[PDB]
Amino acid sequence: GSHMIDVPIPRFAVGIVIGRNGEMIKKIQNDAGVRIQFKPDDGTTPERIAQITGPPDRAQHAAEIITDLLRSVQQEFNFIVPTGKTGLIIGKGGETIKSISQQSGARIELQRNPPPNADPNMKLFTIRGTPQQIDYARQLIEEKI
DNA sequence: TATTCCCTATTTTTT
């Protein structure tokens, strides 16, 4: 009779041997010529045992495909601005902050600093964009401060 | 110094 060999396989991995629509079992079945019958997990372990059978030769070689296959299953930155240079940064109508935001494509929005606890001598400017976009905004900001 | 615009992995078969 053909050699019969069982193969332990986790329930979450059983779908790999069977395959969707049986593309794996049907393909391996045709490529190797073997029939796989899955049986309850014997050993209390949460894994299904696969019972494969086929000619003593195909049984050994087929087991290798499934084993080899189963093994395969096993930027934002804040800019500080002193209340003294704030007028030269925004510019008349924000033509400066906009130019910087559009050319740098980053989104700038003045972050208010709590007067009670924050230092009224300093304001917080929020600046966000893509890593390359935010870096471009910082360059213009400097050369103007 | 006062005012702006943008973005918001599972699955199949026969006995």
Q: End-to-end alpha-carbon separation of chain A, Å?
A: 88
* Burial track A106-121 (b if 16+ CB lie within 10 A, e otherwise): bebeeeebeeeeeeee
Which residue, A74, A103, A136, sits at the end of a domain? A74
Helix (H, G, I), strand (E, B) or coil at A119: coil
Q: Which nucleotides of B are covered by protein (CB under 7 A)?
A: 1-7, 10-14
| Encoded tokens for A72 | 């395969």
> What CATH number does residue A95 fall under?
3.30.1370.10
Q: What are phi and psi of A130, to 5 degrees?
A: -80, 150
Which residue, A74, A93, A116, sits at the end of a domain? A74
Experimental method: NMR
Q: What is the CA radius of gyration of chain A?
A: 33
- A79 lies in the same domain as A32: no
Please spell the DSSP secondary structure of A25-37, one letter per residue. Answer: HHHHHHHH--EEE
* Closest residue (CA to C1') to nucleotide B4 in the complex: A94
Nucleotide nearest to A98 (CA to C1'): B5
Residues 6 or more apart from A36 whose CB is under 8 A from it?
A17, A18, A25, A29, A50, A51, A52
- A97 lies in the same domain as A141: yes
Query: Cα torsion at A16, A17, A21, A26 (round to 10°)?
Result: 150
* Closest residue (CA to C1') to nucleotide B7 in the complex: A107
